[PDB]
């Protein structure tokens, strides 16, 4: 029963494997060979943001291109104005080890979570003055490593208990639950049409999901170690990953195989966070060796280095208009590049 | 007009900045301690005084913060990484023994935990179990330079000094001197185990300063 079940599946692997090669027609490096690069184009630290004590583990941008949110192990969420560098708000927390945070595209709720196995939802409308917690979503057993917002009513979370679980805040319970992965789920990014999403997991894999159907759509395995950073292309057709072995990859959501890898022999630490430029040409990623790295997506060539930091980075992102790119790192410092 | 907010934000920002200056220093009031292991009775006898359990206590007007993980998954390689700000790791033991070595060893060789110190606690006063595990235990001399616990059979005290020296040939095996282990046996004794920590966190924060002045 089990011996045939392993026997059919390795044939079902080869049923997918050699049929995956049926669309392997050329390479991406063969067919971008004509374009000029962007060249050595380097940003500059425009502002610097200093309010945090402990290591800033995660940030998230705004939908207005004006504000951003950040959290660190001291236990403070803080909403930073990017323009004047004036802090809009500060929130105490009951746990400390906030491993992720999120900023809704209504601008009226923010959220966070961590080793407390609880995804707090915070209110920013605040008819009485300061902020307060709306509720919290205790339906997990591992920890929470990423969370995102669909509207002001439902959020999708990552997991230390292998199961990405989408919520509904008025119910306060999981509508659905995705039990596909094997290890830990680190990062997830929402699609540009808020309909699908992918999730990077600790088994060198990522499974495309659906928030309506709840099935497991696809699976992409090309990494050698656990994945930590994963984000969508702006068009809605591709996503680029980064694992803990200094390999940035590229896949496609139609061809269903990988396209382009990004590596260099002088980089030995692991990738931590990733983001994309507005026009999708430039790929940006940070590392553990205390500096960022800006890549072309097409030629697979490093084109920018943002070396202002002096501890390991953990979180970054390009704004929705692409006006700037901000990074955070374990020295509690937030550098905004342009 | 445009500067109507400039009397708000600056006078809101300095409300935040005056608020955090109580918290920049009360962070330095306490000392974080990560307590971990694989066991229950030795782990829930230091609860003498969810997702993660949390307690707090103070001695000699100095307050501590123990953070023992409760409902957590057995794969440890990603929620260990958020624990290098801790002043000291308390590691409690309770063939558990050889498997407890690599749970200590791979902490000691971890890239992010290189700069943090490890306290220890030996429970489980075991004789047939030890030479069943390690063959070269029969070769062992009891340390006489180390005083024994007075009034005990010298095979009981000898195996106590086998594992205590087994960690130390792993701890000092190319540690280079950025962090120091602190072996202690308090096997299920209704005693302090507080001054045996309060003195030994002090030796950690002492040797950090002499390290910063290039004196160690």
């Amino acid at each position, epitope marked *: 029963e089990l011996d045939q079940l392993r026997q059919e599946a390795e044939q079902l692997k080869n049923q997918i494997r050699d049929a995956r090669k049926a669309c392997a027609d050329a390479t991406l490096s063969q067919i971008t060979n004509n374009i000029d690069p962007v060249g050595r184009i380097q940003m500059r630290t425009r502002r610097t943001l200093r309010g945090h004590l402990a290591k800033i583990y995660a940030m998230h941008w705004g939908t207005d291109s004006r504000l951003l949110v950040s959290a660190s192990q001291d236990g403070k969420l803080i909403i930073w104005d990017s323009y004047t560098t004036n802090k809009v708000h500060a929130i105490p927390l009951r746990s400390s080890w906030v491993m992720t945070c999120a900023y809704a595209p209504s601008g009226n709720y923010v959220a966070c979570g961590g080793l407390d196995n609880i995804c707090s939802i915070y209110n920013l409308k605040t008819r009485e003055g300061n902020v307060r917690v709306s509720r919290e979503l205790a339906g997990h057993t591992g920890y929470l490593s990423c969370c995102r917002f669909l509207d002001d009513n439902q959020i999708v979370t990552s997991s230390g208990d292998t199961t990405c679980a989408l919520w509904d805040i008025e119910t306060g319970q999981q509508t659905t639950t995705f039990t596909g992965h094997t290890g830990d789920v680190m990062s997830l990014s929402l699609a540009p049409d808020t309909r699908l999403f992918v999730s990077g997991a600790c088994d*060198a894999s990522a499974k495309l999901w659906d928030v309506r159907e709840g099935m497991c759509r696809q699976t992409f*395995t090309g990494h*050698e170690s656990d994945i930590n950073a994963i984000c969508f292309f702006p068009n809605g057709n591709a996503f680029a990953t980064g694992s803990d072995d200094a390999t940035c990859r590229l896949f496609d959501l139609r061809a269903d195989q990988e396209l382009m890898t990004y590596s260099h022999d002088n980089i030995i630490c692991g990738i931590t966070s990733v983001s994309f430029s507005k026009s999708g040409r430039l790929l940006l990623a940070g590392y553990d060796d205390f500096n960022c790295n800006v890549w072309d997506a097409l030629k697979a060539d490093r084109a920018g280095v943002l070396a202002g930091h002096d501890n390991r980075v953990s979180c970054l992102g390009v704004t929705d208009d692409g006006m700037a790119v901000a990074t955070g790192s374990w020295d509690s410092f937030l550098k905004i590049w342009n | 007009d445009q500067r109507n907010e400039e009397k708000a934000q600056r006078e809101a920002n300095k409300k935040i900045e005056k608020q955090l200056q109580k918290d920049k220093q009360v962070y330095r009031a306490t000392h974080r301690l990560l307590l971990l292991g694989a066991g229950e009775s030795g782990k829930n006898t230091i609860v003498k005084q969810s997702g993660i359990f949390e307690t707090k206590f103070q001695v000699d007007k100095v307050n501590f913060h123990m953070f023992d993980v409760g409902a957590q998954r057995d*794969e*440890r390689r990603k929620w260990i990484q958020c624990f290098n700000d801790v002043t000291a790791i308390i590691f409690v033991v309770a063939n558990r023994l050889q*498997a407890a070595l690599k749970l200590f060893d*791979s902490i000691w060789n971890n890239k992010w935990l290189r700069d943090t110190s490890v306290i220890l606690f030996l429970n489980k006063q075991d004789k047939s179990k030890i030479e069943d*595990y390690f*063959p070269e235990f029969a070769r062992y001399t009891t340390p006489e330079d180390a005083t024994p616990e007075p009034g005990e059979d010298p095979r009981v005290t000898r195996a106590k000094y086998f594992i205590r020296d087994e960690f130390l040939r792993i701890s000092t095996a190319s540690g280079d001197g950025r962090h120091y282990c602190y072996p202690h046996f308090t096997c299920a004794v209704d005693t302090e185990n507080i001054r045996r920590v309060f003195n030994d966190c002090r030796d950690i924060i002492q040797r950090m300063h002499l390290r910063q002045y290039e004196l160690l």
Partner: nanobody
Amino acid sequence: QVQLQESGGGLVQPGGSLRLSCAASGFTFSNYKMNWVRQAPGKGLEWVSDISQSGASISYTGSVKGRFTISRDNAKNTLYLQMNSLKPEDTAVYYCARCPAPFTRDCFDVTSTTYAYRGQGTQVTV
């Protein structure tokens, strides 16, 4: 792709001798430190042996000291383990595991809950 295949197992009466090669592919084998693990029926898992990246440092569990040897062939990415002078209390399901990260000797892999880089398993009957 992470595929940790094995070759061995079988009947042994106490005093026999047998080998184990863990053939595996999918990554740069020279950048990884490799290690074995068994589990008795009725007990948990326990680390038995390892090897470093170069092959220099070698360690064993005390109860299996001097009776097993562990090596690799980094050219054709295998993992050779030789079992000599068998003992009746060593019948257990074995695995061939990999430490998660490259370039560093720290490992957290003995756990039960589907560690992502242990093989499909073997079985020995002593």
